[PDB]
Design a protein around this nucleic acid. Sequence first.
RNA 1: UAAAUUAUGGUCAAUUGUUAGUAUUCAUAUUAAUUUUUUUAAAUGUUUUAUCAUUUUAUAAAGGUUUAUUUUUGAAAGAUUUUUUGUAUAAAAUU
Length: 49
Amino acid sequence: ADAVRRAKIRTVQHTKNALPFAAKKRAAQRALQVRRRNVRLEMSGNRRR
RNA sequence: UAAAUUAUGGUCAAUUGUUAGUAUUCAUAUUAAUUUUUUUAAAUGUUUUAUCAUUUUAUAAAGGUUUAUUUUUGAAAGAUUUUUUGUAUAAAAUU
Ligand SMILES: [Mg+2]
């Protein structure tokens, strides 16, 4: 009975903390995102002849 | 071919753990799997001016390809001084 109780709140905390955890791990990657690639400029740069 | 010189009148050792620094496993370690994790969907407001203008704002990517590199006198710094003057443009060297 308690093993299902441990499994229930782990999925309950996952539904609540899906949105705020996705914002912090996005901002943690943006600090390491020095000189991101612009993909629409490389695809327009390959189009030029 | 110098021929054994004669108080042997001083023996009682070494080890108390304190070091002038590349040290070797042909089978173990590095790689991918038994395991990876987390995101991202473009379409964009730099600003002051004397106003249809003028003053300040000098290294984004792909492509093409390089033996090598750095420092403006000029703009600013910057001053009760002033000449667009204050030695920047080069060499050796190693695919
Ligand atoms: Mg000056």
